Design a protein around this nucleic acid. Structure first.
Ligand SMILES: Cc1cn([C@H]2C[C@H](O)[C@@H](COP(=O)(O)OP(=O)(O)OP(=O)(O)O)O2)c(=O)[nH]c1=O
Ligand SMILES: [Ca+2]
Ligand SMILES: [Ca+2]
Ligand SMILES: [Ca+2]
Ligand SMILES: [Ca+2]
Ligand SMILES: [Ca+2]
Length: 901
DNA sequence: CGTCTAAGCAGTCCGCG
DNA sequence: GCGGACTGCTTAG
């Protein structure tokens, strides 16, 4: 097998690399790597190295990396560009792995751990580490074992050994329900004291040194706590054994409001699962506790125990250890579903970066572009300082707020990357500028043709057409990977709908799920067998199809995110290829394309309908258009359709055979107008929307920009067994909206779109009547809480104090002097509840950490003083009023002359 | 901590004769 | 009451 790196570090003048050798063994080596950098030189001087603009360069080979770094400094002092890859480990990887890396995940040691720390005086601060570590569970991917390190003797209590037999039993048997599939994989080690636990842990770590280190909040809690505790007990040298190169560094992580410290472990790649989740899941959650995320992703019940966590070990050590093991397993289960570790390895090895650098699209793209240019003996420019400057973005059409009955949508495939490719936007393809007209003049095709030689964007930029730039070339590669995975995702989705249909008629037999690849559309033979399967089999198949769909989604969306990140990186001042001319070439071209195609679609549809000046495009945002299909449906007549699916077919065909050809023609003309390199504006049909045939549903409504709802029957070729709501921007989609309120508003919208005014009124009346029975958590608002200190004036709100911050200050007074009460964490999320006039808390709201029950000290008082009336008006009635006025509907029945009877 | 801009709504403060 | 200037938060793309 071909070799591949595991980790790489620069330590002084040495590269330290852990790698898999040609025999599949893990190895480590120290290499005194001599880097090269570059300077411009005279043309008379013969060289094979050229910068991206074709100017000749001389290569400078340095005795060591510190010499190369010192040279860069002196070049700045002189005021001359020092070219080349200044991150010497990326250059090392590029020299050492000069081929497309093929990696074998089975050789990569992926460690997942969690620690427990009993603490009587509040949250155990990692930087102090003053309390014993009393449990570690550490799962190793190579061994496939959970290694459990259990402290039996502590100043906070002596306990009995954990019992695997009790752990396996049902909760209903008094057990902990540790899943049976991991029971046999647990290696349990009790310890007499904390020193021996820790020494043994470090010896184990030495034996089985993580390459990828993950877990939940490991980077901000577990790692710094372990490091600092070992440091406190044994000294620094012992703690540095967590690094294979015995090198660590306290790293300061800064944001807008403050800073925190983490421990960098040289020769380990830390991918904290909470951060993988936030980057790759495309969710925004009310809470990021493992309990909350586990329940959301896996539908497993919250880990239930009595008393505070600080007393759990002494009261129920059995449960304490079991829950520590289950916590590690839940992370593995989330990853089995989401596959973020797989994704990270894929992207990291593709770009040839330290795996942990996948969190930074700038670093990822810098590496991809560098490797691409180095292949042609080209030399990358030096990174420079730029002041942050605002620049213009997308166009968004102002919609007329209303109901809209039949709607077809279309949008560009990979909009911004396709613009890059079409126009040929790249640092080295800049050909010059042209004299710009107002955008409106390009949109309406009255402006002079920008160029007869170069490829243009209406921001004034021109690009070479003779050869693809490195940015278009490399973006195309990733786009092509994205397209492949999206294919698998959509197949699994369509396959899921076939199973759903079949579940309407399950067979009465005993059988098994079919062994199939859900990434490919089911053959006729498979469809036939599915029609004969039991519900049990079909449900197992649906689960597997949906798991396949999730895996395709992870793979496709994050490749989408990467290529879109390059468009944005051009407007980031830390990017080597930062250029506002290129960033705005993309956004301004995007603005033109949307308004251009709006004009063309309106013109086309007025022609087919025989009208003039009618607005068929009702809305658009960035790269999308929403087209009213009412007139299309009415030309055939609703009476002529057999069912809903009949008109959906009709619109799908109309979109495919009439709309898309017309759109393509419009865009080909625009490509000629801008003289672009290649026509790549592909605006495919997204959604087909409308009410159920024969119903009084309104189909859809807009309230404003970025706020709408549609009843969708077909999405990107997926024909649903049951219609699905596409809701954007409305309160049902916001993590700040109470859980139960999200649910109720969605049901109100469903009724509006599917059933009509009377149905909505019946539901509203019921919700208003019963909502006071809803659990307090389900009706609490949610907000992030920043700058709590700024607004705190002696425990009370200062000027301009935000509502949620006021809530926190109320909470802080209510729990004052109590070290055991949960503290609100600056920058994290809180639940927020309004309080009625005259409450003992002395203010109008209270807030507490999200994902938690409010502390028992004050719970009963909060429940007693909760303002249900204010809550209802603010979170439910107000948004509903917004939806219904926009839709021209009433949520409460207005009096009529029939009331006389 | 980690690409980008556009733009919505909640709430504070205060004007609006 | 609403709305504008402003801060804060959160989405859509
Ligand atoms: C969703 C999203 C879009 N954008 C920008 C770049 C996108 O090309 C552009 C349009 O967004 P989308 O239409 O959401 O994305 P897309 O066109 O890249 O992909 P698809 O083929 O799935 O339609 O907006 C971001 O910068 N960040 C984002 O998170
Ligand atoms: Ca715990
Ligand atoms: Ca798109
Ligand atoms: Ca599409
Ligand atoms: Ca059947
Ligand atoms: Ca879109």
């Amino acid at each position: 097998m071909k070799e591949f790196y595991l980790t790489v570090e620069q330590i002084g003048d040495s590269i330290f690399e852990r790698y898999i050798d040609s025999n599949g063994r893990e190895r480590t080596r120290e290499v005194e790597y001599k880097p090269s950098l570059f300077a411009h030189c005279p043309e008379s001087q013969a060289t094979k190295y050229f910068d991206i603009y074709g100017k000749p360069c001389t290569r400078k080979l340095f005795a060591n990396m510190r010499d190369a770094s010192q040279w860069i400094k002196r070049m700045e002092d002189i005021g001359l560009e020092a070219l080349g890859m200044d991150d010497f480990k990326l250059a090392y990887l590029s020299d050492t792995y000069n081929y497309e890396i093929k990696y074998d995940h089975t050789k990569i040691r992926v460690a997942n751990f969690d620690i427990e720390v009993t603490s009587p005086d509040g949250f155990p601060e990692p930087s102090q580490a003053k309390h014993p570590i009393d449990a570690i569970t550490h799962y190793d991917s190579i061994d496939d074992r959970f290694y459990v390190f259990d402290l039996l003797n502590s100043p906070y209590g002596n306990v009995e050994e954990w019992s695997i037999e009790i752990a396996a039993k049902l909760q209903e048997q008094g057990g902990d329900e540790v899943p049976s599939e991991i029971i046999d994989k647990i290696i349990y080690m009790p310890f007499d004291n904390e020193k021996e636990l820790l020494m043994e842990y470090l010896n184990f770590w030495q034996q089985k040194t993580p390459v990828i280190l993950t877990g939940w909040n490991v980077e901000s809690f577990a790692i710094p706590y372990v490091y600092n505790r070992i440091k406190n007990i044994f000294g620094e040298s012992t703690a540095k054994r967590l690094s294979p190169h015995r090198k660590t560094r306290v790293k300061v992580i800064e944001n807008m409001y403050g800073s925190r410290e983490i421990i960098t472990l040289f020769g380990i790649s830390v991918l904290d699962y909470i951060d993988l989740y936030k980057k790759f899941s495309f969710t925004n959650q009310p809470s990021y506790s493992l309990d909350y995320i586990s329940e959301f992703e896996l539908n497993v019940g919250k880990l239930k125990y009595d008393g505070p966590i600080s007393k759990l070990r002494e009261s129920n050590h059995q449960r304490y250890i079991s829950y520590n093991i289950i916590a590690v397993y839940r992370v593995l289960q989330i990853d089995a579903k989401r596959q973020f570790i797989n994704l990270s390895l894929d992207m990291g090895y593709y770009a040839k970066i330290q795996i942990q650098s996948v969190f930074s699209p700038i670093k990822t793209w810098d590496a991809i572009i560098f490797n691409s240019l180095k292949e042609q003996n080209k030399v990358i420019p030096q990174g420079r300082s730029h002041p942050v400057q605002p620049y213009p973005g997308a166009f968004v059409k102002e919609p007329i707020p209303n109901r809209y009955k039949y709607v077809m949508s279309f949008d560009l495939t990979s909009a911004y990357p396709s613009i890059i490719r079409q126009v040929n936007i790249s640092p080295e393809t800049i050909a010059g500028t042209f004299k710009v007209a107002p955008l409106h003049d390009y949109i309406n095709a009255v402006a002079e043709r920008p160029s007869d030689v170069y490829s243009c964007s209406p921001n004034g930029m021109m690009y070479y057409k003779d050869r693809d730039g490195v940015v278009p070339t490399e973006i195309t590669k990733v786009f092509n990977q994205r397209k492949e995975h999206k294919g698998y995702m959509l197949a699994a989705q369509r396959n899921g709908e076939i199973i759903k249909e079949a579940l309407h008629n399950p067979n009465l037999s005993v059988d098994e799920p079919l062994d199939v690849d859900y990434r490919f559309d089911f053959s006729d033979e498979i469809k036939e067998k599915i029609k004969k399967l039991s519900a049990k089999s079909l449900n197992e198949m649906l689960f597997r199809a949906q798991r396949t769909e999730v895996a395709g989604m992870t793979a496709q969306i994050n490749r989408k995110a990467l290529i879109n990140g390059l468009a944005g990186a051009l407007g980031n001042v830390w990017f080597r290829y930062y250029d506002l001319r290129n960033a705005t070439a993309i956004t301004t071209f995007g603005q033109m394309a949307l308004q251009w195609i709006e004009r063309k679609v309106n013109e086309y549809l007025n022609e087919v309908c025989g009208t003039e000046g009618e607005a068929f495009v009702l809305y658009g945002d960035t790269d999308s258009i929403y087209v009213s299909a009412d007139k299309i449906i009415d030309k055939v007549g609703e009476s002529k359709f057999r069912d809903t699916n009949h008109w959906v077919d009709f619109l799908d065909k109309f979109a495919r055979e009439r709309m898309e050809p017309a759109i393509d023609r419009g865009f080909r003309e625009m490509c000629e107008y801008m003289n672009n390199k290649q026509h790549l504006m592909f605006m495919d049909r997204e959604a087909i929307a409308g009410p159920p045939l024969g119903s009084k549903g309104i189909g859809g409504f807009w309230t404003g920009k970025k706020r709408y709802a549609l009843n969708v029957w077909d999405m990107e070729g997926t024909r649903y067994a049951e219609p699905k709501l596409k809701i954007m921007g409305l309160e049902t989609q916001k993590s700040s909206t109470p859980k139960a309120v999200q649910k109720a508003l969605k049901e109100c919208i469903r009724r509006m779109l599917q059933e009509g005014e009377e149905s909505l009124q019946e539901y509203f009346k019921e919700f208003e009547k019963e909502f006071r029975q809803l659990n307090y958590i389900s009706i609490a608002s949610v907000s992030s809480a920043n700058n709590i200190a700024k607004y705190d004036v002696g425990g009370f709100p200062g000027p301009k104090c935000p509502f949620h911050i006021r809530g926190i200050l109320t909470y802080n007074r209510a729990i004052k002097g109590n070290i055991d009460a949960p503290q609100v964490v600056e920058g994290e999320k809180v639940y927020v509840l309004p309080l009625r006039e005259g409450n003992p808390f002395g203010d109008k709201c209270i807030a507490w950490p999200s994902g938690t029950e409010i502390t028992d000290l004050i719970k009963d008082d909060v429940l007693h003083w909760m303002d249900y009336t204010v809550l209802l008006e603010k979170t439910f009635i107000k948004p509903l009023e917004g939806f219904t006025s926009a839709a021209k509907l009433d949520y409460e029945k207005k009096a009529s002359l029939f009331d006389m009877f």
